[PDB]
Design a binder for this molecule. Sequence first.
Ligand SMILES: *[C@@H]1O[C@H](CO)[C@@H](O[C@@H]2O[C@H](CO)[C@@H](O[C@@H]3O[C@H](CO)[C@@H](O)[C@H](O)[C@@H]3O)[C@H](O)[C@H]2NC(C)=O)[C@H](O)[C@H]1NC(C)=O
Ligand SMILES: CCC[C@@H](CCO)Nc1nc(N)nc2cnn(Cc3ncc(C4CCN(C5CCOCC5)CC4)cc3OC)c12
Ligand SMILES: CCC[C@@H](CCO)Nc1nc(N)nc2cnn(Cc3ncc(C4CCN(C5CCOCC5)CC4)cc3OC)c12
Ligand SMILES: *[C@@H]1O[C@H](CO)[C@@H](O[C@@H]2O[C@H](CO)[C@@H](O)[C@H](O)[C@H]2NC(C)=O)[C@H](O)[C@H]1NC(C)=O
Ligand SMILES: *[C@@H]1O[C@H](CO)[C@@H](O[C@@H]2O[C@H](CO)[C@@H](O)[C@H](O)[C@H]2NC(C)=O)[C@H](O)[C@H]1NC(C)=O
Ligand SMILES: *[C@@H]1O[C@H](CO)[C@@H](O[C@@H]2O[C@H](CO)[C@@H](O)[C@H](O)[C@H]2NC(C)=O)[C@H](O)[C@H]1NC(C)=O
Ligand SMILES: *[C@@H]1O[C@H](CO)[C@@H](O)[C@H](O)[C@H]1NC(C)=O
Ligand SMILES: *[C@@H]1O[C@H](CO)[C@@H](O)[C@H](O)[C@H]1NC(C)=O
Ligand SMILES: *[C@@H]1O[C@H](CO)[C@@H](O)[C@H](O)[C@H]1NC(C)=O
Ligand SMILES: *[C@@H]1O[C@H](CO)[C@@H](O)[C@H](O)[C@H]1NC(C)=O
Ligand SMILES: *[C@@H]1O[C@H](CO)[C@@H](O)[C@H](O)[C@H]1NC(C)=O
Ligand SMILES: *[C@@H]1O[C@H](CO)[C@@H](O)[C@H](O)[C@H]1NC(C)=O
Ligand SMILES: *[C@@H]1O[C@H](CO)[C@@H](O)[C@H](O)[C@H]1NC(C)=O
Ligand SMILES: *[C@@H]1O[C@H](CO)[C@@H](O)[C@H](O)[C@H]1NC(C)=O
Ligand SMILES: *[C@@H]1O[C@H](CO)[C@@H](O)[C@H](O)[C@H]1NC(C)=O
Ligand SMILES: *[C@@H]1O[C@H](CO)[C@@H](O)[C@H](O)[C@H]1NC(C)=O
Ligand SMILES: *[C@@H]1O[C@H](CO)[C@@H](O)[C@H](O)[C@H]1NC(C)=O
Ligand SMILES: *[C@@H]1O[C@H](CO)[C@@H](O)[C@H](O)[C@H]1NC(C)=O
Ligand SMILES: *[C@@H]1O[C@H](CO)[C@@H](O)[C@H](O)[C@H]1NC(C)=O
Ligand SMILES: *[C@@H]1O[C@H](CO)[C@@H](O)[C@H](O)[C@H]1NC(C)=O
Lengths: 768, 768
Amino acid sequence: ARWFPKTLPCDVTLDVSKNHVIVDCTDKHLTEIPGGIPTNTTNLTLTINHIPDISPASFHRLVHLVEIDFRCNCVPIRLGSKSNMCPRRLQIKPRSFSGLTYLKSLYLDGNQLLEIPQGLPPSLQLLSLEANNIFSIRKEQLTELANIEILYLGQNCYYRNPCYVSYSIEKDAFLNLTKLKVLSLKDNNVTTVPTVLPSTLTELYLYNNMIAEIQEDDFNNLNQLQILDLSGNCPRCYNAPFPCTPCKNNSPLQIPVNAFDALTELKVLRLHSNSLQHVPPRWFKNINNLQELDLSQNFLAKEIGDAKFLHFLPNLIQLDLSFNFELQVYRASMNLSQAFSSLKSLKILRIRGYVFKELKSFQLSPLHNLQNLEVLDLGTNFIKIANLSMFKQFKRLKVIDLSVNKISPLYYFRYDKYARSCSCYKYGQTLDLSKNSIFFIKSSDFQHLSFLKCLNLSGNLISQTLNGSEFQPLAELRYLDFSNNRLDLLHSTAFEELRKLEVLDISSNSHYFQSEGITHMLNFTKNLKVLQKLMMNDNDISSSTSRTMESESLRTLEFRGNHLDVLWRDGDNRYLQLFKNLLKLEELDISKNSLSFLPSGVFDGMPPNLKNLSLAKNGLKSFIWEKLRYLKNLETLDLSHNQLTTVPERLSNCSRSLKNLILKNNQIRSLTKYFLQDAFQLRYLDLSSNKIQMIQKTSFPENVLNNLKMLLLHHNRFLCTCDAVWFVWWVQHTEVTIPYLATDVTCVGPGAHKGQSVISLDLYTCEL
Amino acid sequence: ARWFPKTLPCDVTLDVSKNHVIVDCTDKHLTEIPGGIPTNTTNLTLTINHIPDISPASFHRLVHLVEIDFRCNCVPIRLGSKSNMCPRRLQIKPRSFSGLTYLKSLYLDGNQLLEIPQGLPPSLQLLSLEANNIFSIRKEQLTELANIEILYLGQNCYYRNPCYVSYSIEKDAFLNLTKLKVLSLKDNNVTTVPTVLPSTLTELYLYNNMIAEIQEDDFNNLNQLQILDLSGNCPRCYNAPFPCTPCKNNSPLQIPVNAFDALTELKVLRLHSNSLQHVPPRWFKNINNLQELDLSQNFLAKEIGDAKFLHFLPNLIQLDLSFNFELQVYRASMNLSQAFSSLKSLKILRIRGYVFKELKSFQLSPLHNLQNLEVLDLGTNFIKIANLSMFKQFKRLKVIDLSVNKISPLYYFRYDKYARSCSCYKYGQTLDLSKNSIFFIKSSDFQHLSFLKCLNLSGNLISQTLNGSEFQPLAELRYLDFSNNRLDLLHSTAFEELRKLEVLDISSNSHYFQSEGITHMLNFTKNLKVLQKLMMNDNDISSSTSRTMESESLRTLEFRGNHLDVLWRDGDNRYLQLFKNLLKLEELDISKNSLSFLPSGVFDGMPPNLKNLSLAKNGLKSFIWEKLRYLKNLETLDLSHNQLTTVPERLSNCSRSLKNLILKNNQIRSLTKYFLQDAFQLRYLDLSSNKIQMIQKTSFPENVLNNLKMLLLHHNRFLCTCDAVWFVWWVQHTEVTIPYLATDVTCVGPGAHKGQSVISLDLYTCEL
Ligand SMILES: *[C@@H]1O[C@H](CO)[C@@H](O[C@@H]2O[C@H](CO)[C@@H](O[C@@H]3O[C@H](CO)[C@@H](O)[C@H](O)[C@@H]3O)[C@H](O)[C@H]2NC(C)=O)[C@H](O)[C@H]1NC(C)=O
Ligand SMILES: CCC[C@@H](CCO)Nc1nc(N)nc2cnn(Cc3ncc(C4CCN(C5CCOCC5)CC4)cc3OC)c12
Ligand SMILES: CCC[C@@H](CCO)Nc1nc(N)nc2cnn(Cc3ncc(C4CCN(C5CCOCC5)CC4)cc3OC)c12
Ligand SMILES: *[C@@H]1O[C@H](CO)[C@@H](O[C@@H]2O[C@H](CO)[C@@H](O)[C@H](O)[C@H]2NC(C)=O)[C@H](O)[C@H]1NC(C)=O
Ligand SMILES: *[C@@H]1O[C@H](CO)[C@@H](O[C@@H]2O[C@H](CO)[C@@H](O)[C@H](O)[C@H]2NC(C)=O)[C@H](O)[C@H]1NC(C)=O
Ligand SMILES: *[C@@H]1O[C@H](CO)[C@@H](O[C@@H]2O[C@H](CO)[C@@H](O)[C@H](O)[C@H]2NC(C)=O)[C@H](O)[C@H]1NC(C)=O
Ligand SMILES: *[C@@H]1O[C@H](CO)[C@@H](O)[C@H](O)[C@H]1NC(C)=O
Ligand SMILES: *[C@@H]1O[C@H](CO)[C@@H](O)[C@H](O)[C@H]1NC(C)=O
Ligand SMILES: *[C@@H]1O[C@H](CO)[C@@H](O)[C@H](O)[C@H]1NC(C)=O
Ligand SMILES: *[C@@H]1O[C@H](CO)[C@@H](O)[C@H](O)[C@H]1NC(C)=O
Ligand SMILES: *[C@@H]1O[C@H](CO)[C@@H](O)[C@H](O)[C@H]1NC(C)=O
Ligand SMILES: *[C@@H]1O[C@H](CO)[C@@H](O)[C@H](O)[C@H]1NC(C)=O
Ligand SMILES: *[C@@H]1O[C@H](CO)[C@@H](O)[C@H](O)[C@H]1NC(C)=O
Ligand SMILES: *[C@@H]1O[C@H](CO)[C@@H](O)[C@H](O)[C@H]1NC(C)=O
Ligand SMILES: *[C@@H]1O[C@H](CO)[C@@H](O)[C@H](O)[C@H]1NC(C)=O
Ligand SMILES: *[C@@H]1O[C@H](CO)[C@@H](O)[C@H](O)[C@H]1NC(C)=O
Ligand SMILES: *[C@@H]1O[C@H](CO)[C@@H](O)[C@H](O)[C@H]1NC(C)=O
Ligand SMILES: *[C@@H]1O[C@H](CO)[C@@H](O)[C@H](O)[C@H]1NC(C)=O
Ligand SMILES: *[C@@H]1O[C@H](CO)[C@@H](O)[C@H](O)[C@H]1NC(C)=O
Ligand SMILES: *[C@@H]1O[C@H](CO)[C@@H](O)[C@H](O)[C@H]1NC(C)=O
């Protein structure tokens, strides 16, 4: 179909709507900028490569460039790879970017640059220089950036990329940048807030620095500021998973009471990890539109009980007061101030790491009349006693998170959560009791909680024989996550009281299935009349008392990580019809079941409307492809990560309906003579990570290839001799999507073509 | 330096003491018996091969053969592999074994033979024909076996190898075999006990058959019988993991009261899975020397309460009454008859699967004065309540097994446990409480059990902050298995009360290490003054409050399955000396820790007496070999299953003490010019499963190679051209142990030599 093959090692996407010709060369092991890049290229990306220098020859013909994303070409030694370390820093010669008069964005992050690149065009609106060795900002170096709007200079002096000296900023360095909206000097060893900053700033990030005190003048002219982040200045270092140095004498970040007076348009204020002991109400005197306030990782345990500053925050949407506990005090109860009732517009409230022994209904009374409250997160508190019926006065809430607690009958601790690199809530009211010490359950525990749509009891100590009476009040429940427990299916009436249950997860409940002679009733699904999805993964199921699983509604069953090779032992025909009576079953995942072979009767004993079947990671050494005729509605068949050596003689003769066939990571050395002859329903074929040497025209007919949405042939043992004249010509001139063509579709031999891509091959010698 | 290379594909071991020249060809993918087998061969083994026939040419010149082990050459379709199924049964032509006048043993198991091979020598003492299609025994066919002593004919007609008809045995078929000591007709569809059997029988096995009734005459002349096994005749099929057909009307195996009268020398009687409801005392009237009695998988729950037959068994050593529960009764208590006190010589008593709610001290009173009692196993009983202090009257016992129970504050079910294929008890008194519902522990729980030397609390629900007061009475404890629990190391005083503790297993206690911000005190080892081995595997440890683990006695630490890549994050120098203060540490396993690279300071921060270190399954892309100089007492270094591409330039310049280096399963394509030059201390090197093409004398000097105990070079990409002239010659003429030489040390190329072994290569063309 194509007259000229695309030999460039980059993915070229055209977007005529926004007029962008995008060339993506991300992680293509390039030591030079490749030749033949389109002249109309607007967005050129060369991220994760080993190009040692940039010169006027680099973007000589690409005058229409609007963005250059030249990131991580010489990433610092500690942040980057150790197998392929950068020998020398990126060298930018003069007049490299001056000729590109249309350049709006330029990312030169992770390149070990010592200074700000000079000679940049006046049309540049965004400049990113993160993870470099630029630790001294001078006014003369910023003169070229007259029209810059976004400027990232962070991660230039911190534990992962040290500079061994304090960050220096000349007085009024950013002042004459009259269009600067976003400025970020995060993770830089900055000692004072740089002044005078331009009034047009909308976002300012000075987090994870050595700023010990804020002056009252530091933000006197930032009347258009929306986001301010002064986190990690005098940090709370208890259990920090990174080198953490707190301020001397355990003092907090000293912020004057009138420091935020000029910030009338402030929406987000992040004071995370600042060792604050008090929050003065005077801070929020002129801040009426504050929507997000993060006060996590401070010493505000006593302040949570008084918190007079909450009366000055009626438009606050998000409030975070996590990990504020007194280092050596295990409180008896949580004391929330009555001022929390004045937070009329609050939707999310997170108070993790408060650390208290007992939660009571009256302790959450300041939160009763907060009509817009959606999320109440009291996780990681080590709560031992909590009457779950107290949440009957919180029916309007979407999520009630009590995860990681001791109730019985990396986000807040990571150094930089916005670091740049080179679920059942949709069902309704969720009550998360995951990672808890609940060992026994009864109907009275879930009393007055009939409104719940999802209950996550994952990671608990429940080692009970459920008989259909432990969740009687949970009538509206649609999702129950019972994973990482010790479910004992002695009675087939387990879970029957949950009549509106659509999804049940009983994965990683292997305990009773590991010991011999224990009764297991897998026929418990018959009583659940509206169950759509069931997961019983990693349960090590090798035996069952019941021979059949019945259900008139189940559409998806995940039986991964079990021992169906033991149940379907050759000669034992008892469990071959285990999934047959699941009449509406469309998806069955029976991967990771040690099935070296499939006995006769497994295909006949499959349900009638089965569409997607996965036999992946089983170690299958043989497969009777002709047996796929029994599976009349088969669309997807996943046989990845197996030891299969051959493909069927004629795939169309094995299955009339098969659309998607995944054979990746197998021992296939050759395809049959007429493999895809008349396979008209086939739309996707994966033969990657195999040992295929030759592919002929008869095996891949054109009428079948043209209907394919994608064909994967990468990581194969292709021999590129004159016998492979058809395959090399077809691959080069086809319009079929074949991923990784110019990076992992390689000739293993003969001699000269070893390690060469098939897309850049020229077999003119085979026709003289 | 051998003069003639050993090209035979079998391991030839010489034993001049017993004149045995052993030739082992087990699993060598042979389609013919290989040529050049030594003439003095006594023991020839050809197990797991595809040799289609045996003829007089097979053992023509091997006249000194005392044993032929020709097993699993045509294994039945259901028992064997499906990728390489046998096309036709093994064909034995006439006069194949008649010429071998010294043949004493002949195993022809798993070959689909239809009849007993005829023309065998008169010197044969053992003949095994298991897993074949011989289901009709005639007297004329056993004429040739006049001097046979051992004869296995089982597994010829069962679910894994059916015959579709009952097993037929002619009357007095084995009677004239006047030397027959062992006879086994197990798993054969046998309907009646064959009569008259020869009086010289010492062992008889008729288990897993259709014998519904025993006649009083069946064993009237077996006065020399020691072992009798009539198990699996009228079996108990509840939760059987194999096709199980019980006798009609739930009737047991009908055994007359005087059936065992002539068995005066009987030592072992196995009546497992016979659906017995009563055990008449009259059975053991003339059996005074019975030592083992297996009555498991029967319906003897009520009989355990009366058991008058135990008065006729004073010399019984082992008694098994497991899985005798009434299918639908959960008893309140265990009722053991007072007749158990008359078992003076009993050492092992197993009563698993009795199924009862509460164990009380007085219920075990019949076992108080049994002075020789060593093992009391009451596992798989679902016991909910049991005062552990009751075992104070059982100090003499070696093991008290209460595994798989509900106590809170494949052997019995496999078809044939003797099927032929093609721990802390040494410390002292063990109390096994594994796989139980114990969620909380205190000193009073282990009161009066100071005598215990090992306590296995593995697989329990303990989610407690141990502070050194939960095991105060356990003063003599040397081993504590606390694996598969939820250990919370809040206090560094955990386990300190166990002062004589030598081994501590806290593996698979990942729960609290998975959630952020939780305090973890790994320095708890300092208080344990005699701890020799500590295992903290699969705990997902990514953070720690303490920076150093201290111990003046710990010799072995297993830290597998953790996140040392997170603790030793580049730039974070805080946990690099975590294992340094473990001064007597000789073994450290830090495999499976996601360590793609080792930061600088890990080697310097290692303990001084570290002998063996494992960095296996880490995904290591690079390794600074020169850093091994810090580890001055290093003998073993295991870097298996990693992504290392190169070996050091000079291994001698890296380590002066390294004896064993394991580099299996890596991406090494070539060795450095002078790799093992002057590395005289090396005694073991593994370079198997790598991509090495060439090995020259400069990289592998002979003075260093000759001192090696073993050198593994299998599964490599060896190119066998004239440049590899030295490697092929050395490998052919060396006495150094290289395993898998004539099976997996193969030439990948060029053309002609593809798939050929290097041992059978002839490079005479490279020297003309
Ligand atoms: C962040 O900036 C501070 C400076 O504001 C850096 O601190 C300084 O770091 C250097 C190098 O580690 C220290 O110098 C050394 O001092 C020792 C002890 O006197 C001496 O033996 C060495 O030869 C060397 O001179 C210096 O004392 C230290 N100053 C202070 C006040 O701490 C810090 O390294 C920077 N961190 C990062 C990650 O960039
Ligand atoms: C080795 C034991 C294997 C298995 C055997 C179960 O058949 N037992 C068990 N299997 C599993 N997975 N968990 C447990 C927990 N405890 N038990 C013992 C047990 N608990 C209850 C009964 C009921 C007794 C009363 N019965 C009736 C009640 C009235 O309407 C008719 C049934 C229901 C079972 C019988 C019983 O054992 C005999 C278990
Ligand atoms: C997110 C919480 C992380 C961590 C914080 C503590 O490291 N807490 C915890 N870490 C871990 N692994 N487990 C648990 C279980 N409960 N808690 C809460 C808790 N329990 C006890 C105390 C004692 C209070 C009294 N104190 C005494 C010591 C001696 O001088 C007198 C006071 C000992 C600790 C303090 C405390 O939290 C403040 C845990
Ligand atoms: C090509 O470069 C332009 C200019 O940098 C990118 O434009 C940004 O697009 C996003 C999404 O529409 C906007 O939010 C930004 O405001 C745009 N930036 C500027 C400076 O206009 C564009 O995304 C790039 N194309 C691709 C595919 O990455
Ligand atoms: C070689 O064959 C002889 C004869 O079958 C084997 O001898 C048996 O050895 C075991 C101990 O290993 C004794 O218990 C048997 O009584 C011996 N049988 C006979 C008939 O004497 C010998 O083990 C074989 N050698 C090897 C290495 O397998
Ligand atoms: C065990 O022997 C019995 C006969 O004693 C076999 O039973 C017959 O099997 C055939 C084939 O399935 C049936 O047509 C007969 O009706 C069966 N007869 C009876 C009485 O059951 C049985 O198949 C044999 N089993 C094995 C595993 O060899
Ligand atoms: C809550 O804390 C305040 C101090 O911040 C204290 O005065 C008050 O008594 C506390 N409330 C309760 C119920 O303990
Ligand atoms: C739990 O709280 C409910 C009221 O919400 C009450 O009826 C019930 O008795 C309480 N249960 C316990 C065990 O305190
Ligand atoms: C339950 O919580 C666990 C974490 O504790 C999480 O992995 C899982 O996805 C949750 N369940 C649902 C349905 O979201
Ligand atoms: C269900 O189990 C509970 C708790 O053991 C019990 O009270 C109840 O009677 C049981 N109901 C049935 C029908 O088995
Ligand atoms: C499950 O199977 C058992 C027999 O093994 C039967 O008694 C029980 O009624 C079955 N349960 C259902 C829901 O079909
Ligand atoms: C087919 O089912 C598999 C699971 O077996 C799933 O991962 C895949 O997304 C499904 N594809 C379609 C098109 O439904
Ligand atoms: C398979 O192909 C053969 C030969 O054309 C034909 O006889 C047979 O009916 C086909 N079966 C199916 C299911 O297509
Ligand atoms: C033990 O069982 C016998 C019947 O076998 C019965 O007579 C006796 O009362 C039982 N003992 C107890 C304590 O229940
Ligand atoms: C456990 O038994 C001992 C006697 O061996 C007794 O002193 C103790 O009180 C008992 N404890 C309980 C909880 O029954
Ligand atoms: C404890 O029991 C488990 C099985 O429940 C076993 O794997 C482990 O080896 C036992 N511990 C010891 C020290 O033998
Ligand atoms: C140890 O913990 C127990 C509770 O398990 C407590 O009674 C005791 O006072 C504690 N001792 C110390 C020294 O902390
Ligand atoms: C463990 O370290 C903590 C500080 O992190 C210290 O308080 C405690 O004494 C240490 N324990 C031991 C046994 O060294
Ligand atoms: C590992 O070290 C132990 C001593 O701690 C030693 O006995 C053992 O032989 C070593 N393993 C190997 C493979 O050398
Ligand atoms: C050992 O290696 C170091 C580092 O490459 C090198 O400087 C030194 O010369 C080597 N030792 C010898 C004896 O060559």
